[PDB]
Amino acid sequence: MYTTAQLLAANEQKFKFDPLFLRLFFRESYPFTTEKVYLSQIPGLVN
Amino acid sequence: TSKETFTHYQPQGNSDPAHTATAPGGLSAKAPAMTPLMLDTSSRKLVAWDGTTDGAAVGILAVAADQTSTTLTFYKSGTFRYEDVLWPEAASDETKKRTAFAGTAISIV
Amino acid sequence: TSKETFTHYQPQGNSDPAHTATAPGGLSAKAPAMTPLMLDTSSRKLVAWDGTTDGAAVGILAVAADQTSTTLTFYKSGTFRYEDVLWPEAASDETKKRTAFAGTAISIV
């Protein structure tokens, strides 16, 4: 039982990740107050 | 449940200092710690003491070794218990085992 | 021109003590220091070790003497190196020269 066996290191080496997208293209968040969403756009093309 | 034993290990039984030295060993087995040894008759290398060659117990092994070990280290002095040191099975008499190392600095109790 | 290297002298090889002892001598001739000895089968006198007889190693003389000295002083214990101790030319095998002093308080490295 002479196994006192001190531990001294807690290395993780878990993961590698960085989004960059939410802070690059979607700097704005719009929470929903309703059940649905409504997104639209008007194109411009004229002779 | 997990009731095991942790036994204190003291090869020495007296205040006599024990001393070690090495010599080219011709071991032909897997000798563990605290094994008696003898000198060979023809090549006079070092081998495990079989217990049969009377009066030829040279020394007591210090650290385990094998064939790859060209030379072996062993105690040259000191006093040791009768039970702590393992013995060859051929050495099946207590008196022979006890007095085997008489005449050297190696002593047994 | 003349290149000489001073060398520290360490006849011993290990911290184990070397104990001297004086005994009646039957030395053949002038034997310098660090010389192995043996006991005569017949006269039981101390004569320089031949280098042939197995187990004849008993001790190593301390201070150089000759045949005119009735008593000789020699180390009965300790450890010494291989190259420093001079040997009779008979012991022409390094392993034998090493394990010549086995079984006693005299040890070699």
The span from the CA of C31 to the CA of C71, in Å, is 13
Tokens of C102: 């086995």
CB–CB contact B59 C108 (8 Å):
no
| Phi-psi sector, A16: left (phi>0), alpha (psi -120 to 50), beta | beta
CB-CB contact of B101 with B74 (8 Å): no
Structure obtained using: cryo-EM
The span from the CA of B49 to the CA of C92, in Å, is 26
Stretch (H or E) spanning C95: helix C94-98
The span from the CA of C50 to the CA of C34, in Å, is 14
Sign of CA dihedral A21, A23, A28, A31: positive
Interface of C with B in 17-76 (CB under 8 A): 54
DSSP tag of C38: E
CB–CB contact B23 C105 (8 Å):
no
| Closest chain B residue to the Cα of C80, Cα to Cα | B21
* Quoted resolution (Å): 4.1
Q: To the nearest whole angstrom, how far is the Cα of B54 from the nearest Cα of chain C? A: 13
Tokens of C76: 């009965």
Please report where in the chains the tokens 């220091």 appear, as a residue: C33
- Cα A24 to its chain centre, rounded Å, is 12
| Structural domains in chain B, sorted by start | 20-108 (2.40.300.10)
Query: In 3-state terms, what secondary structure has residue B26?
Result: coil
| Closest chain B residue to the Cα of C99, Cα to Cα | B23
How is B48-108 classified by DSSP, letter by letter? E--S-STT-EEEEESS-B-TT-SEEEEESSEEE-TTTS---TT---HHHHHHTTTTSSEEE
CB < 8 Å to B4, chain A: 1
CB-CB contact of C77 with C105 (8 Å): yes
Stretch (H or E) spanning C108: strand C106-108
Burial class (CB in 10 A: 0-12, 13-18, 19+), B21: buried
